[PDB]
Amino acid sequence: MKGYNVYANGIRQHIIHFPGTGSPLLLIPGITSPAVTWGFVAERLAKYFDVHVVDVRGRGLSESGDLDYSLDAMADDLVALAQRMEGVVVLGHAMGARIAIRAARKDSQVFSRLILVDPPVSGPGRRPYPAKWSWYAESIRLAQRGCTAMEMRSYCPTWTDEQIELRAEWLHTCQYTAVKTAFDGFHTDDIHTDLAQLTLPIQLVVAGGAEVIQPDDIAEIISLAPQTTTYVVEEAGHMIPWDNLEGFITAVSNR
């Protein structure tokens, strides 16, 4: 693993490289997931791709402070990174999938294809994202104070010891205002009007055991982007590689 910073879209973007010999892949994590927290997955994916895991603005070591934390700005960040790479695959998880959708709408030419992992399908006039805001708010403030793995375990009781320790260590780097903005974005941004404009290859990877994406939501996505292929990791929760690591890796390799 080797971390590095780039100056792109007018901000410092921190990226962790997990070297591989395959196609380059930019991994865009979810709302409270600094790049380092995807390390256990990225090292597995690096057997197949050359993996670059992004700290989204307001998370980890990337630029923070009084920034635009909208989906538009995060999408611009991703376009700026991808401009520097040739034929990059984007794998986005959750918020990161919404970022991938909007970025590809802005500039499809810089991406080879998208892997969209359990994006919220919320938006104006749509079913709200099925998560409690308080879970993020309370755990972030706890982490900001300084807390142990055992204290963090109450929020992620099904995770491994190492995963919980890492979250206790890094969650505070997810700026509160950035996380609040993203959660509101799940409700205020329309990613469906973006999907309707996408013509590049798309794999949709669904957490079968979660309620984030229901079957009629898959049907809507297909209607909007008929090229989309769907892989359902059956019985897996929203944080797919935390619930079923092997299941997740199977979903994004040999496809």
| Structural contact between residues 17 and 2, judged by C-beta atoms closer than 8 angstroms | yes
Please state, in angstroms and rounded to a whole number, the distance separating the CA atoms of residues 185 and 196.
19
* N residues, the chain: 255
DSSP string, 39-95: HHHHHHHTTTSEEEEE--TTSTTS--SS---SHHHHHHHHHHHHTTSSSEEEEEETH
DSSP SS3 for 212: coil
Resolution in angstrom units: 1.6
Phi, psi of 120 (to 5 degrees): -55, 140
| Residue 204: half-sphere exposure toward Cβ, Cα within 13 Å | 26
How far apart are the C-alpha atoms of 110 and 98, rounded to whole Å?
17
Do residues 78 and 85 touch, judged by C-beta distance below 8 A? no
Question: Percentage helix, strand, coil, to 5, in the chain?
Answer: 40, 20, 40
> Class of the 2-255 domain?
alpha beta
Residue 24 and residue 87 in contact, taking contact as beta carbons nearer than 8 Å: yes
Residue 246's contacts (CB-CB under 8 Å, 6 or more residues apart) are: none
Calpha distance 68→65 (Å, rounded): 9
